[PDB]
Structure formats: structure tokens, C-alpha cells
Ligand binder design. Structure first.
Ligand SMILES: CCNc1nc(Nc2cc(F)c(C(=O)N3CCOCC3)cc2OC)ncc1C(F)(F)F
Ligand SMILES: Nc1nc2c(ncn2[C@@H]2O[C@H](COP(=O)(O)OP(=O)(O)O)[C@@H](O)[C@H]2O)c(=O)[nH]1
Length: 1111
């Protein structure tokens, strides 16, 4: 709680007025001030206990050219002077009036002194009357007309004033110098002083990390929670500058020397018509520790062939209207008292769109000429013999000019709705009509012409009814004549009813009743009585130009009852289907309704439009049939506003579905503040809308989640089944730093995957415990438990992961490394038993239910390499290839050998690829291999086929075999898989692995696992971490799957929750190993096709719509 006494002064001094001269004479070569020039000014008041008053003084430059960049520095908590000469007379105060008017809106809680200058040649008696009449214009406390350069002025009353304002001037009833601010704040300021000396001279900036390091490094005791509050406070007193604005993206940097930013305009001013200059090559001529000075972020200065408005000429150029007649041209008018500082800059910027041409943009008017058919001379014409100012648009009275005027007036009214609120009141529109051509123009304000037209669009001369002028060619914005002629109401062919029964939703400003239009069914959106035409145009700027097959469409629009006919969504909104038909949302439809909305948002954000209102009641469905082309459109663009790279300043949003910065409306967000609403939609789709009704209880609890943002784990509490690939969106596109969210194209891309609609679970075993052999549970009904054979320790462990609970309940039952496992499921006597094959060569046996039933079978001659489980025959393969046959009747027997060894090889030949077939169900076609030699056998235990494979990678032993109609053979470190036919016993195909991997990439394209789906496709798992979804048919590649693992160890097919079709996968993360277990849904090969055909369908739809729309 330390005292802090340092206020800021802003002498806004016009040119020639001697603001610098008065400051110099007050604070005890003066060519001009090129921009702001900040100084300090210490003083000690006469009172003994008077706080040390030091005024951070800004000697604001006053040439008109600089004005466009001024308002961004005029902030609150500052006493604005004003300086106008008196040798000019009553004209000088009139010329100073715009400055006071601009102060009146940029900061109106700031006291304003007002001081003349150069009283040596003044006539005070005249100007005193109008100066008193000045006291809309803010609280000009006290005029203090004073001398020029000598010392005969009591203007030091400023000090007096401010020390009164030390407690009179009250930001929220506080004291500007008496704020009991913590000592950590002042310590931050103290270290900022030295940081300004340490920071590069021509590159003043510090990052966040350095600030966070020095906070604790110098024992400040400052917490990270109040740290942004501390930054904001110091920015208020003006010792540093920080731009929280997400649209600017400069939230990372911190500016320590505010004396530098003020002069960047001056420097860049003097780095063919102006506003055209070469690339900003001067960005590297300085220190510039980046590819720009002080960071790469200079070019984001909202104050590359260059355009700058400040240096634009101030004379109306030599441009003549192609036509001249009262009948042939419309002219709109806006009556405004004072052009806000920085208007024409924003206007030129916004009107540098060329998609609604020889230009001629001067400092106070754009000009856009396509041809003698259509031009739009937006320009300032104060020549009215009146004090106020007129902004006038001029267009030719043909339909092309109407389509131009009706868009220019929307863009101007969006400028004046987002950036300049104070004007709208002061703003007063006008339309210029004339009955008999040649006579002068007669004006009528717009609020009256709108009603005169609503009554009837045949505007009558009040003097004599013999003259008639249609409201079309005088003001076609009001009667909706500037619209493509395909969309126009035809009320004869419309039969709506406003009755209660025929009602649908009620989306905020309006209602939507169903009706008939041409014979089909439609959704007539008649507006309320208290609704302005501006909202109609705000929706008809989006609904009549953009065409996309995931956005709602317009069938008509008319001004008589002010409706908007739109196509009907038969199946209902997303909310009314996420509260009733809960069980109709499968895992496919839940992804289609999130892909179509993402595509809609992509097309929106690609036309410079922000939606801002992505609720779950503005996602309409058309057909719940999971496999279609147009499932989910978007509707209710009631507050959708244009959004360039500059950003938006208003704050509209339904409480609970807003970005974190939208709620704190002080900052200016951008298009990427919408992806948060989409993430919230995705969180409300994943959990079947539980959050909706939970937020319905309390509006404060509904809005805290967009302010506090403590969202639960959706899989834990709400009960939803795990979707472990979309939970990487919901946990990514819900962040707090807007720069770190995925862009809309990048969240459409992540959602345009067949993996996401598949990876169905994902488990990570504990740190550095590894699996080498997996076996599922054949019961599939007791629970979802999958025993795993560990291999990390020298001894052998037998873990048992339980899939639904994720509890790794390992155990140590083996002495040596565990190599193979198998589950014998005999309903006879309820004998479900798991046996294993150790690297030592013993067949350990364990019962699932019995905690201790270790009936260790008679150990084989050598180690164990594989095992296989109607026919309940156990076929054990040793490293010698001495295949053994046990039996299921000896499950209780503790050590035995039921049948004889069918030895087919020696110790040199390792035998582990045993497999059966799904063709004809006859186990007699069991295949396999002993060493570098394939073989088969049957129940007769005879070798009915031995096919040696001795014919660089062609000299390796066998690993896996699968048999549906041919043979597939993998061998150790083989980029190929040697195919064989079971009829000719000859090698037919050679499916090269790395050849296929060449599209995604001493190549580690190994083959460490292999599986074969029933009759659809292969799953070839590569030791490099890829899953080759090879098509079984002839050669086609469905998809290669990667970027989730580093080495796939084992793969197999299992069953979960009494339903089949899951594909377990056990993978390495390569000495730190994180053994991972994905569980795919084996519908994946048919999915990659169905999804790709769907996408390719609607992309054709989107192109047929957009291309034809140009006509
Ligand atoms: C904001 C909703 N607007 C629309 N809504 C619809 N369709 C429906 C919306 C619904 F919600 C329900 C519904 O389930 N209801 C239950 C009772 O309460 C409301 C009606 C039924 C719909 O069509 C049959 N079509 C077009 C529109 C658009 F405005 F976009 F044109
Ligand atoms: N009329 C008049 N002008 C003065 C007097 N003393 C200084 N000036 C002018 O006032 C100017 C300073 O005005 P300033 O606010 O810095 O103008 P800016 O640089 O364009 O913003 C100097 O350039 C002087 O030429 C004076 O006694 N009478």
C-alpha cells in the first residue's frame, strides 16, 4: 500500500498555436514536432504534505496529416489541455472545435482545461462570448487566456487544478494520486526504468518470459494473477504500453519505451498517387533482431507494397462525373457534426474491396469506376453554407449503381456500428430527390422516406400530385430493390398464418412460422413490430450473396410485412433433438453435424464474415439418415458482421456460448474468437447436451464457463463414451490465448479424417513397462479384460488390463521372459483358462476365476515360440519346430503331454506363425512355417505341403501367415510381403511396402505385424509406425495411418461389450518407452471410402452453387 503520484498530461496543440512554445515557457530550434514528443515535468506544490506531482507530458503534434494515428494514444486518466491562437479570431476556436469533439468521445471522464495563446495580438472581447457559449462538447472547466512567451500568466493554476484533481478527478470515485497501490507495483516500475536502459536502443520491447523471470528474480513478491492487472495499471499511468487486443495479436510483446512508438508514424511518413510505395525494406536497415524491427510484428501496426492514408493529397482530384442529371443519378447524404479522427482511414481501408477498376482515392474520398455503367463517388462535400459536414455517395440510377449503393451503405453503417458508436442522434441521413429534372436537389431524411415508402412505393409530390417519382430510383436501400431479381416476394403465391399452432422456433429478434410457398413447405421469418430495417439488411447481406451447401438458403424477401422466406428444416434444431431423441445420435451423425458446421464456418470466415452466435439452437438438421450429403445447415445470421483483419469491437453473444474475450468487451477480437463457440458446440454434441440443461439452472452459472472457464472432463462426469481423437480438439480449441486456437480451416481439416470417426479408445500403460504378446478374452461377456505378457524385467510378469476401468493390475507369476499366450474357453465345466509360453520353455497355466490354480504343464524340450487355441486343440510351437499337440481335457492335469510331437524341423528352424482360415471353416487347412520354409497340415497331423522359401531380404525366417484365398508371408526386416497361392504353390505377388510408404516419406519400412479382415482388407502393421490399410481386392491402397505411434508391436481383432469389430493395436513410443494401446473400429476401410465419396460429393455441390451464383 504505497502512495503513487504521477498523472499524465495531453496538450493537444494545433499547428502554429505554439503548444511546444507554451510547454517550454511553462516547464522552465522549435521548428516543428513530427508526431508526439513525450517529456516529464517534475514539480513540488506549495503545500508541505503535497504529494510529489510529476506530469508525464505529451506534446501532441497538430498538423492534420498526423491526425489518423492520434486517437490510439489519447486514453483516460489524463488532463487534456487545448491551444488555439487568438490572432485568427472567432475562426480559430471553430477550427479547434473538432479536437474538443474528438476528446468528447475518446475519453469523456477526463477533465479538460482550455487555454488561448499569444494574447499580445489578441482581441479577447469577441472570442470570449463564443468561448463561454462552448461550455457534445465536454466539461471545459476554466478558460485561461494567457500570454505568448513572457512570465505574466497564472497558468501554473494547472498544478493547482491537478492537485485538486488529485482527488476531485475520480476514476470510479478514487484518487489519481492517492491509490494505495502495493509496493510490488512500484518495484515493477522501478525495474522497468532500468529495463528501458538495458533494452536495445532502436528496438524497445520485452517478451513475457523475461518479465516473468525478473518478477521473481529481484524479490518483488508479485503474483502472476495480479500481474496483468499490474500491467494495466502501469499502462494507465503510462510508463509502458501493452496491447491486450487479440486481433492485433501483440498480447505477447511488452513495450517499455513509449517515447518510441509515437515517432513510428513520423519515420514511416518519409520512408503516381500517394498510398503507393515500395515494400517495407527499411525493416532490416536497423538493429532489428528479426525480419522487422524489434520483432516480426511491426507490419501488424493498425495505426508488401505500401499504402498509407496520412500522406494522401488533400485536394479533390480532377475527376468528373461521367453523367450529370438529376434523373440519372442517385445521391445519398450523411449529416455529421464532426468527422471523428481516423474516419477516412478506416473508410478507405474498408472500401479497398473490389468484389461487389481505376481508382482515385484522396484523403477524404474513395472513388471506384468500373465503367460508365457504375461508379461510386464516396466523398466529403462541406459546401452547403452550413457548419456541419456531409458525407455524400453518388451513383448512377441503373441497377448496377443500385447494387453498389446498397453495399456501400451497409459497409459504412458497419464501420459506424463497430468502430464509431458515439455517432449513432448526431448522425442524420438524407436522400436527394427531384421531380422535374434540372431543378436543384431536395432532401428528405431517411426515417421518414422509409415510412412513406412502406405505405406505398409511388412517392407523391406533396404540392401537386401530377408528379410521381418511384422510391426505387431515389432510395433503393429501403424497398429492397438492390437485390438479385431471383429472390423477391410474390405475396399472391404465399399463404402463411400467424396463428399460435403453426409456430416453430423463436430466434431472438424474430419468429419463424411454417407456411407454403409455390406448393412446398417453407419457414416464413416475419420480424417483430419493434425491429429496424437495419437488421433486415444485416441478414440480407449474408443470405443473398453467399451460397454454400451447409448454410441456410433464401427463397424470397420483401419489405411489405418484412419477412424472409427460408427453406424448412424438417428434422428440427440440434437442441430439440439433443433433449428428446437422445439415442438417435450415433458416432457417425455426431461427426457429420460437426463437419458440416465446420465447413460452414470455413466458408463464412473465407468471406470476411464472423458468425458470433454459434449456439446449439442454430444448427438445423434436415435428415437424421447418417449417410447423406447435406445433414446440418446453419441459420439465424442476425448479428453476423463483416470482419477484416482489423477486428470487431462490439460484444454480442448468448451467455455461455461466447469466447472469453467477447465477455470482457474492452478488447477487440477477430475471426478466431468464433472457433471457441464451435468448440463449445462440439462439447455440447459430445456429451448429448447435458451442459445445456445444467447451465439452464442459473444464468450466472451459465455465463461463468465463458469467464472462469472451469470445464469438467467430459468423459469422466457426463458419462459419454470416450472419443480420444476429438478430445484433442475440445482441449485445444478452448484455450485462453486466441493465437493458439486452430484456425477454422485447420479444424475442418482435423475433422475430415476417417481416423477420428474411428479411434475409439486409447490407453497408455505405466511408464517403462512394455508388452510383447497380447490375448483378448473369448468370453466377451464377463467384462472387458485383456491379459498382457510383460517383457521389461528379466523375470516374467502377467499383467491384466481391464479395458473399461483402465486399471493396470499387473502380477509376477513367471520366472523367465514371456513370449506367447493363449486363452482356452470351454463352457464345459466352466473352464476358462489362460496358458503361456515362456522363453525358458515352460507352459504355465492360470485360471481366470481361481487365484491359485497353477497347473504347470510338462515343459517342452526347448523354448516356446507360439500357441493356438469345435476343435479345442492346443498346438505349441517350440524354437526347434517340434510342434506339440496338447488337449483341453488336460486343463486340470498338472503336467502332461497328451499327444505326440510332430517334429518338422531342428533347433536352427524357429516355428511361430501358426494360423487358421475363415474359408469353409475346416481347420484342416491350417498353415504356418518352420524356419525359412512354409508348410501346412490337417487334423490327420500330416505335412500335406512343405514349400521352402530359400529363394537380399529373401533369406529370412517366417513371422506371420494369413489364409483367406492365398498366402501372405512376412519375414524379418522385409520391405516386401511374399504372396503365394495355395493351389499352384508358386509365388505370385510381391506387395512392396516401402513403395507405398514413398508417398508419405536406409528405410525403416519393416513389417512387424499383419492381420486380415474377413473379406474386405488387410491391416499390415509396419515397425515404423504405419498401418497399411491395403485393399484385399487386387492392389488398391485405402489409406496409410500414422502420427500416433513409433513402432507397432502386435495387432489383432477382438470384441468389446458383447459387440465384435474392434482392432487392438500395441505400439512403442521410442530410452523412454510409453507402451500404447489403441483400439480401432474395423469399419475403417469402408469408412475411408464412404467419407471420401461424401466429401467429394458436397465439394461438387459447393462448386455448382458458387459458380452458378456468379450469373
Ligand atoms: C431457429 C429454428 N428455425 C427453423 N426451424 C425449422 N424447423 C423446426 C425446428 C424445430 F425446433 C422444430 C421442433 O422440434 N419444435 C418443437 C416444439 O417447439 C418448437 C418446434 C421443428 C421444426 O420443423 C418441423 N426450420 C427452419 C428454420 C429457419 F428459421 F431456419 F428457417
Ligand atoms: N504566432 C506565434 N507563433 C509562435 C510564437 N512562438 C512560437 N510560435 C510558433 O509555434 C510553433 C510551435 O507549435 P507546435 O505546437 O509545436 O506546432 P506543431 O509542431 O505543428 O505541432 C513554433 O514552430 C513557432 O514557430 C508566438 O509568439 N506567436
Amino acid at each position: 500500500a504505497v502512495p503513487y503520484n504521477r498523472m499524465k498530461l495531453m496538450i493537444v496543440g494545433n499547428t502554429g498555436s505554439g503548444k511546444t512554445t507554451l510547454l517550454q515557457q511553462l516547464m522552465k530550434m522549435q521548428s516543428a514536432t513530427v508526431g508526439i514528443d513525450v517529456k516529464d515535468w517534475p514539480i513540488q506544490i506549495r503545500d508541505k504534505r503535497k504529494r510529489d506531482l510529476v506530469l508525464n507530458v505529451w506534446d501532441f503534434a497538430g498538423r492534420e496529416e498526423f491526425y489518423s494515428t492520434h486517437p490510439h494514444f489519447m486514453t483516460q486518466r489524463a488532463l487534456y489541455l487545448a491551444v488555439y491562437d487568438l490572432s485568427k479570431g472567432q475562426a480559430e476556436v471553430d477550427a479547434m472545435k473538432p479536437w474538443l469533439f474528438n476528446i468528447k468521445a475518446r475519453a469523456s471522464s477526463s477533465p479538460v482545461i482550455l487555454v488561448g495563446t499569444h494574447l499580445d495580438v489578441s482581441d479577447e472581447k469577441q472570442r470570449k462570448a463564443c468561448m463561454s457559449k462552448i461550455t457534445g462538447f465536454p466539461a471545459i472547466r476554466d478558460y485561461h487566456f494567457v500570454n505568448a512567451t513572457e512570465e505574466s500568466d497564472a497558468l501554473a493554476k494547472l498544478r493547482k487544478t491537478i492537485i485538486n484533481e488529485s482527488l476531485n478527478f475520480k476514476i470510479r470515485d478514487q484518487l489519481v494520486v492517492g491509490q494505495l497501490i502495493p509496493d510490488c507495483y512500484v518495484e515493477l516500475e522501478k525495474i522497468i526504468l532500468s529495463e528501458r536502459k538495458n533494452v536495445p536502443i532502436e528496438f524497445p520491447v520485452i517478451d513475457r518470459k523475461r518479465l516473468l523471470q525478473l518478477v521473481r528474480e529481484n524479490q518483488l513478491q508479485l503474483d502472476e494473477n495480479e500481474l496483468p492487472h499490474a500491467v494495466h495499471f502501469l499502462n494507465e499511468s503510462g510508463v509502458l504500453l501493452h496491447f491486450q487486443d487479440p486481433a492485433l495479436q501483440l498480447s505477447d510483446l511488452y513495450f517499455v519505451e513509449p517515447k518510441w512508438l509515437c515517432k513510428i508514424m513520423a519515420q514511416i511518413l518519409t520512408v503516381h498517387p500517394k498510398g503507393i510505395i515500395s515494400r517495407r525494406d527499411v525493416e532490416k536497415f536497423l538493429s532489428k533482431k528479426r525480419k522487422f524491427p524489434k520483432n516480426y510484428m511491426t507490419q501488424y501496426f493498425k495505426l508488401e507494397y505500401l499504402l498509407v492514408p496520412s500522406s494522401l493529397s488533400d485536394h479533390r482530384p480532377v475527376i468528373e462525373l461521367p453523367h450529370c442529371e438529376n434523373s440519372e443519378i442517385i445521391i445519398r447524404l450523411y449529416e455529421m457534426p464532426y468527422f471523428p479522427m481516423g474516419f477516412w482511414s478506416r473508410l478507405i481501408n474498408r472500401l479497398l474491396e473490389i468484389s461487389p477498376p481505376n481508382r482515385r482515392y484522396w484523403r477524404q474520398g474513395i472513388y471506384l469506376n468500373w465503367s460508365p455503367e457504375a461508379y461510386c463517388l464516396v466523398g466529403s462535400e462541406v459546401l452547403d453554407n452550413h457548419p456541419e459536414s456531409f458525407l455524400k455517395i453518388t451513383v448512377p440510377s441503373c441497377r448496377k449503381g443500385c447494387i453498389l449503393l446498397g453495399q456501400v451503405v451497409d459497409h459504412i453503417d458497419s464501420l459506424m456500428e463497430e468502430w464509431f458508436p458515439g455517432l449513432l442522434t448526431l448522425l442524420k441521413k438524407w436522400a436527394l430527390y427531384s421531380f422535374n429534372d434540372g431543378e436543384e436537389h431536395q432532401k428528405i431524411l431517411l426515417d421518414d422516406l422509409m415510412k412513406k415508402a412502406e405505405e406505398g412505393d409511388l412517392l407523391v409530390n406533396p404540392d401537386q400530385p401530377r408528379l410521381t417519382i418511384p422510391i426505387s430510383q431515389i432510395a433503393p436501400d429501403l424497398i429492397l430493390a438492390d437485390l438479385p431479381r431471383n429472390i423477391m416476394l410474390n405475396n399472391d403465391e404465399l399463404e402463411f398464418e400467424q396463428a399460435p399452432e403453426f409456430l416453430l422456433g423463436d430466434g431472438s429478434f424474430g419468429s419463424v412460422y411454417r407456411a407454403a410457398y409455390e406448393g412446398e413447405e417453407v419457414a416464413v421469418k416475419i420480424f417483430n413490430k419493434h425491429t429496424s430495417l437495419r437488421l433486415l439488411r444485416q441478414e440480407l447481406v449474408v443470405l443473398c450473396h453467399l451460397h454454400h451447401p451447409s448454410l441456410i438458403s433464401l427463397l424470397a424477401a420483401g419489405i411489405r410485412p418484412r419477412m424472409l422466406v427460408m427453406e424448412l428444416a424438417s428434422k428440427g434444431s440440434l437442441d430439440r433433438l439433443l433433449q428428446q431423441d437422445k439415442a438417435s445420435l450415433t458416432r457417425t451423425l455426431q461427426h457429420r453435424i460437426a463437419l458440416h458446421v465446420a465447413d460452414g464456418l470455413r466458408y463464412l470466415h473465407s468471406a470476411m464474415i464472423i458468425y458470433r452466435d454459434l449456439k446449439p439452437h442454430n444448427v438445423l438438421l434436415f435428415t437424421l439418415y447418417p449417410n447423406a450429403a447435406i445433414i446440418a445447415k446453419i441459420a439465424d445470421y442476425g448479428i453476423a458482421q463483416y470482419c477484416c483483419r482489423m477486428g470487431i469491437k462490439t460484444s454480442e453473444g448468448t451467455p455461455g456460448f461466447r469466447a472469453p474475450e467477447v465477455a470482457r468487451g474492452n478488447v477487440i477480437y477477430n475471426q478466431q474468437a468464433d472457433v471457441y463457440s464451435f468448440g463449445l458446440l462440439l462439447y455440447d454434441i459430445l456429451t448429448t447436451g447435458g451442459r445445456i440443461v445444467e447451465g439452464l439452472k442459473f444464468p450466472n452459472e451459465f455465463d461463468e464457463l465463458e469467464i472462469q472457464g472451469k470445464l469438467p472432463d467430459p468423459v469422466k462426469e457426463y458419462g459419454c463414451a470416450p472419443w480420444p481423437m476429438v478430445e484433442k480438439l475440445i482441449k485445444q480449441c478452448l484455450k485462453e490465448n486466441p493465437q493458439e486456437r486452430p484456425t477454422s480451416a485447420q479444424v475442418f481439416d482435423i475433422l475430415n479424417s476417417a481416423e477420428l470417426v474411428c479411434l475409439t479408445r486409447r490407453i497408455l500403460l505405466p511408464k517403462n513397462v512394455i508388452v510383447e504378446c497380447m490375448v483378448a478374452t473369448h468370453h466377451n461377456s464377463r467384462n472387458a479384460s485383456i491379459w498382457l505378457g510383460c517383457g521389461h524385467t528379466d523375470r516374467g510378469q502377467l499383467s491384466f488390463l481391464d479395458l473399461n476401468t483402465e486399471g493396470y493390475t499387473s502380477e509376477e507369476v513367471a520366472d523367465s521372459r514371456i513370449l506367447c499366450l493363449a486363452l482356452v474357453h470351454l463352457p464345459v465345466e466352466k473352464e476358462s483358462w489362460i496358458v503361456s509360453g515362456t522363453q525358458s520353455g515352460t507352459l504355465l497355466v492360470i485360471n481366470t476365476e481361481d487365484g491359485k490354480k497353477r497347473h504347470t504343464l510338462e515343459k517342452m524340450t526347448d523354448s516356446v515360440t507360439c500357441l493356438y487355441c469345435q476343435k479345442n486343440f492346443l498346438l505349441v510351437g517350440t524354437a526347434d519346430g517340434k510342434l506339440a499337440i496338447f488337449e483341453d481335457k488336460t486343463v486340470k492335469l498338472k503336467g502332461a503331454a497328451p499327444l505326440k510331437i510332430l517334429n518338422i524341423g531342428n533347433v536352427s528352424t524357429p516355428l511361430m506363425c501358426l494360423s487358421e482360415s475363415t474359408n469353409s471353416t475346416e481347420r484342416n487347412v491350417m498353415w504356418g512355417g518352420c524356419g525359412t520354409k512354409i508348410f501346412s497340415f490337417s487334423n490327420d497331423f500330416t505335412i500335406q505341403k512343405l514349400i521352402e522359401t530359400r529363394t537380399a531380404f529373401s533369406d529370412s525366417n517366417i513371422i506371420t501367415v494369413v489364409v483367406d484365398t492365398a498366402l501372405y508371408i512376412a519375414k524379418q526386416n522385409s520391405p516386401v510381403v511374399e504372396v503365394w497361392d495355395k493351389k499352384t504353390e508358386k509365388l505370385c505377388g510381391l506387395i512392396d511396402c516401402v513403395h507405398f510408404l514413398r508417398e508419405v516419406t536406409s528405410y525403416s519400412g519393416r513389417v512387424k505385424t499383419l492381420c486380415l479382415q474377413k473379406n474386405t482388407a488387410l491391416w499390415i502393421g509396419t515397425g515404423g509406425g504405419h498401418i497399411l490399410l491395403l485393399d484385399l481386392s487386387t492392389r488398391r491402397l485405402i489409406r496409410v495411418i500414422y502420427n500416433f505411434c513409433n513402432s507397432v508391436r502386435v495387432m489383432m481383432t477382438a470384441q468389446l461389450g458383447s459387440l465384435k469389430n474392434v482392432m487392438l493395436v500395441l505400439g512403442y513410443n521410442r530410452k523412454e518407452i510409453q507402451s500404447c494401446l489403441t483400439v480401432w473400429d474395423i469399419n475403417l476401410p469402408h469408412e475411408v471410402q464412404n467419407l471420401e465419396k461424401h466429401i467429394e460429393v458436397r465439394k461438387e455441390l459447393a462448386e455448382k452453387m458458387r459458380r452458378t451464383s456468379v450469373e
